[model samples]
Target: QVVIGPGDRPETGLQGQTTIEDVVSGRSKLPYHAGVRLVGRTDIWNRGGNLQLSWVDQCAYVSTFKQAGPITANSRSALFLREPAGVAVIDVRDPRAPKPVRLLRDRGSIDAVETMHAIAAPGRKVLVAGAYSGGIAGRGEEDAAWLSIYDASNCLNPKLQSEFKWPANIHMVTISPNGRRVYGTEVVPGLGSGKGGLHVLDISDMKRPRYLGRFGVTRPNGLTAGFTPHEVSISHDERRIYAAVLASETGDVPVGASILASDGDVPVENGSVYILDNSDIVDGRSQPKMRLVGEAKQGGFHSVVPASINGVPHLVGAAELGACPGTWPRIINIADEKNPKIVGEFKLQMNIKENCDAIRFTPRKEDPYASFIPIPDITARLGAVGSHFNDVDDARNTRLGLFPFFAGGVRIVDLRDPTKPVEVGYYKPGANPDTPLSGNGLNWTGLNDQVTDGCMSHVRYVPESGHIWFACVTTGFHVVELNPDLRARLGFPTV
Candidate 1:
């Protein structure tokens, strides 16, 4: 049980420090860091599934899985764990030897369903598994995307108690702190370009999980069962459920999602975030009334926080404001959930100084050469001219692009006030300033540029340990600190 401190220059001139000590041994894995190494993909890869890490007593645990078969569009994903397909559970009592103690997979229990993501509840051994409707190009677009309820009561013997499947694609599943309600978001579908919305389930009867009807945009195609709802966040009061949605038509494409690289453009879908009131969910006639709440047509909103800014309710999301064509930071004000306001914005700064202020019209076509290697030597044997896009130039710098490809690094914002959002401090896991710049190096510009090929994806702070665990996409796991002093220096405003 190591604790983490804030990201800062050490008192003795060290780059980072460990602020807390392990409860059992009094020694901490301070400077709790995430060191990620890209693992190859799986046979099925859809919306990169969920990533999360949690610690129980003295043991720390981490897990991630890409959509395997029919559900995802890609044939394989990139983050594969060791310990077999389903046999990857660990016991971290002995931090050094936190090896696999039991296999957590069973094909039979999954019911031909592929998992897009999974999450475990805190203080309990319950695990929630989200099912992907096969790759984006799979056969059944209307298949039953599901949520598997696992009884992790005995961490060593995690068993499937029951499974709940929905008609839409389940991209994310979030359970309340009291464990009363489970919120799952639908992924964008192949043909339906509707806004994917939220599905509130009454888990009062965990065995017979009943649906309490759908809530969100029914605009045009309405919320596509597959697209609209991305990540759902419950306000601390649990009265309001804020959903972060990708409100664009862009689906998952591999070519240009990477901004720093010469590949095409960052694969960006129509992005937007929504807010809903779940105050009456437990009641018989509960309806999740959807409100535009907060939306941005250009940049996509990844994660969101509904804390206070100057003691007023504020909504802040990881947005691609001016970051590359597909990257940027955008914070909005939803004090009036009905009348949303864009309070803060930060454009991605260029890697080079010369192109920092330049604006290149966002490209409409994917770059064919972005993924292909030029056959300079092989061309001598065959006439393969024009194999690569001639427009790519390493010397030419592009604007900040926030495609998750590279910007998956850890980022924190000070939204003590929505209209007055400020950049506090951020760290690019696996992205050290002292490290040499390579084709795969990470770059972080305060408030403006924070890009890392290291792929820092999902992040969370453990209240008990004060340890912030971040799940890097292809890279492995990273841990950080929530030091009070660090927050103050970074301008983090507490309500």
Candidate 2:
């Protein structure tokens, strides 16, 4: 792995320094790259930061999730009510000179704009955002959860066309390639589980979204199905849905813990991925449920993207904060949907199983991640050390794959062989010059460097260009591309 040592210089003395601690302590420079180049960047932290990124040709739509709580400062959300904000529309016509063109400020029912789906419609553009009301003190006029659709015919300036509200909160939302169907997974932590599960909508009429059906796990075959599914990706055929059964607050494994008799063992009830048949859900008939074709046990898995490699079906998944406090992506073969098989995994040096001991556990509340947990005496570790989201070049079949790996940085891998997914390039941003990030609408304070620095969430890969657009949790958005040699090796033009 690439090491940036003391004085922000590239060297190899520090064996297991956290990304943020290493930088803030005058250990590394502002940029640590390998086979990757930084193209451009734009500050998207106006009222706060965003998590997800969706793009068309010239524009990028980023969703700002609602903060969690009745508190004025909701850490999970960008302070929308406190500031002029909504969905961010950025112009990336010039990758190196990306700018926030406009803000889709239909802030009424759009509290938690956690997930966004941008697609091309006939003679116009469309954007979909599924949100759940968050922060009692920072909610919109309606102060409820909803799924809002926008007419983005004008990419820069968009108008709210329609919205669907559900008293039971929503989590992740995704759409099919044709843009004819919408999928919403629900989560009712306070209410009942009857309302928490998968929901389908028909958007054949861009202005009207008809409710199709809902799917819940009556029996999860021994796996604990999360009420709040983190993320899901529609299969290329749109006949199936690859969803993450992201169990939360259950796998906070500590350093040097005996929990794992052997290294690389997944924690109990760490969650899994379910490949469900979507035919009945879209029809809104038969059973109003989705059939689970297969499942794969994955600890700390946050999101998955169903794409192709060598013209065969495969699923690429990234794990969020986890047992070791850090994890990487897994490549699985789903040719037989009934039985998903793990083909390979992509990991950095720190992501290695044995290296889990190198990271130190926090003992104080100064560490927001560990301290904020409702559990008593919880020792938090690497907050920004795992993968969050990954978008492939194309779902049909592509050679390049990439994901926004927090602290680990943005990683791009080569998927020529499904069994051996290799990292061809990566870009890890170093720390800034100790600038206070609080009260400027960033919501959260810089309480812990390990959790604060190097946090990133989403990345959108540009097809055939070897370029990608990504968002930083603390900084802004950025444009990056594979270096010449890496680009050539991936069969992408080395421009």
Candidate 3:
């Protein structure tokens, strides 16, 4: 069944993977929800889905991120002139109709405007953004970069505080819970050229920022396919670091997920949870060294965050060699930092990655599902490595998390007992009817271009609105509510 959980991954095969009918119900690949109630949706003024989101004063601020490519001058012109790199300030005061209030527009000099973190500081809320640029806007020639710091005190119109120059390309950005420091992870393939690794910036004095040391599980061996990471989080106590080292390592020939192990029992050396003791760095001691704590190895991990389960510390992450021939959310226990272990793993039938060759990559041109899936040769029928970002609902309730599953949708997990993370509820909006599922699309507008290109992005749960906020690459931004059963399970009022 599509709803099966609380069990081990299927021993073998793609028998449990989602199908065309399951991922697509009608003309559009949307409205395929189960326990999630739709509250509202907006493509943030039609800009489409490839973006990052954060919150301040009940408003949602989304970054407009894009990579280089689209064989048309029209698209090129759009990037530099019309829809240049920027952030869309949305008014989500009312979840039913999120309004796009302003576009904190900027020149398209660098690469993209990606991951963001919002801090609630004294008398003002601060927003930190990491954008990668090989050139200006990452399109220039110097291989330079910078992090955008915004005075979001106004919430609606964020004021730019500074564009602090950074040494590496930033893929994911994380801020300390106390707003004292900010961490950035480097992207793949661009590692060697940019000296990629985890970069730390002390924001204690936002005006006079201090750049700290970097720690990576990589060596310069001319390999660029792996040693790549998507996200990282500071330990609850701010003394440790958890980096989601993605598929493959520097040892591979071309350096990437060279072989997709068909057997789940067969070990793969791609994804590993690189944990390190950053005690000295957290406290800003002299010549700090990030000592190796331990690594909880796995398949191809991406996007990791630390959270506590019933007073015990744990690490939750998504492993995506495509989450099908890939891995999904797996919980790693780090009660003993030096000896971390995997205590729980949650996977969809398609995520079993047992026999990936048979999984559907694309539907037939004549297939009815083809029209729903605008992409010509790719489908999230099972899952892809598109993106698998997550968020915990600790503000309103602890021990609950919202994780994105490419085409599988956003899943809600009960981490109260992280040892057996359970799926309590989930919500996957249908496809945008005329979307270009195979190619790049805008985050705010999906007019014809395409988005997810049918996957979801990082999710955030709004305790105030009782809605789950997330963006689908296939459609746009969405705010959803939990079904009665799910609400009751989480001990919420079933009004």
Candidate 4:
């Protein structure tokens, strides 16, 4: 039986600790999240089991996000495109069908909806979007802010009435509950290339939004990862804005769990959360007022916020190594904004170190940024580290060192006690835990790419059905059972 609360202080079952990098790199070698969820397993994907399903037709190759509107008796769903094709609606709704009921036929490729789109209001029908690149008809660099507004009122041909282009790409975007204020986090080009910091925009007039300066979150020089605002989130009340600021900081010889414990700061910079006073943000481009409420200490942070676990608000963050040289997988935690403490951590074994001195260097594969660096044989060296110790057991020995790396997955933790958050449940859609590392074995995906590569991204709950819908980038959409007993224990009022 899993322990659901902090009061049940059971000793940490972790057998050992490995440097962050070794564990992460080893896990990274396994596989990616895209294949398994999108093309691998059908049954699980269709039902959102540990697997996910597609929101749009397979032809679209939709990537980026699966956003939802205010929960209602008839709550609706939509998809945000990383790179949308012609004939793609400015806004996509009724995700069950991607062929927009109302078509806003366009000439060139639709800008990548870089940030997750948020429902402007619950009852009303308007959705706001933040694009990574400025809106240019075709590829190649252009001088545009990449901001857009869509009238999702009709749910079909989301008309793109207005758009804006600023120097920096607007990485993360959001809106207020009243639908008057539009907030965004811009990633300006930094030193070596200067990336700009966070900026808030006034959207009282949807047609003409004024620039509200910036909140001062810059990327360190010499180590600029392109001033890209990775993840942006707003509080449930829409008063507090949560933005994830990432920086490049890794030691020269990264080892086990090195990925999770990266100490190299992005020079003078670090990941921080800026608490903004939303009241003034609604009227003018004036610096409404802001404060650096929290900062990330270890690995670079990608996502953060007060996530509702069973309807109870809990602060959680998706912490990645930010291109660290180590093997630690991204860690999830309930950070104390003021104190910024680590409440819980989840991953495979901790002890993992790369035998770079003795291993052969393989060619790196191409990726979104660049081909991953080549390294030596790690599988053979895994056991030498603390990862493969003989004393570890299943009940409490949860570690990613032994498993593959999936970009974004949910690791549920019991945080009833802020001081000691404990991992209780984990749902990864990418890999099959059932598959043994060395086996008389089975090809879990059985040539099914979707099942083999799916990974869970974001998740939300639907009270009426006692179900949780997860935003899975790899597998697609995932729905899970929300047992009343479990939900209540986790703090859900009803579902």
Reference-based TM-score of each model: 0.60, 0.78, 0.76, 0.55
Question: Looking at candidate 3, what is the lDDT of residue 254?
Answer: 23
Q: How does candidate 3 score on lDDT?
A: 0.58
The Cα local distance difference test for each model comes to 0.40, 0.59, 0.58, 0.35
Where does the lowest 10-residue lDDT sum fall in candidate 3? Answer: 443-452
Summarize candidate 1's per-residue lDDT along 308-348 as a digit string, tens digits. Answer: 54545555454332222334445555667766666665432
Stretches of candidate 2 above 4 Å error?
A: 1-21, 24-29, 45-48, 66-80, 108-113, 121-124, 134-141, 190-195, 217-228, 247-270, 282-288, 299-301, 359-382, 432-452, 493-495
Q: Which 10 consecutive residues of model 4 have the lowest summed lDDT?
A: 386-395
**Candidate 3 TM-score, C-alpha based:** 0.76
Q: How well is each residue in 191-300 modelled by candidate 3, as lDDT tens digits? A: 32323567788877667778885555532232223345667777666787777775334433122432222223343333667776778776768866666577777623
Residue 329, model 1: Cα distance from true site in angstroms: 3.4
- Candidate closer to the true structure by lDDT (higher is better), 2 or 3: 2
In the range 176-200, model 4's lDDT, one tens digit per residue, is: 5565555666543431122445666
Q: Please report the candidate that would top TM-score against the real structure.
A: 2
Question: Which should have the higher lDDT, number 1 or number 2?
Answer: 2
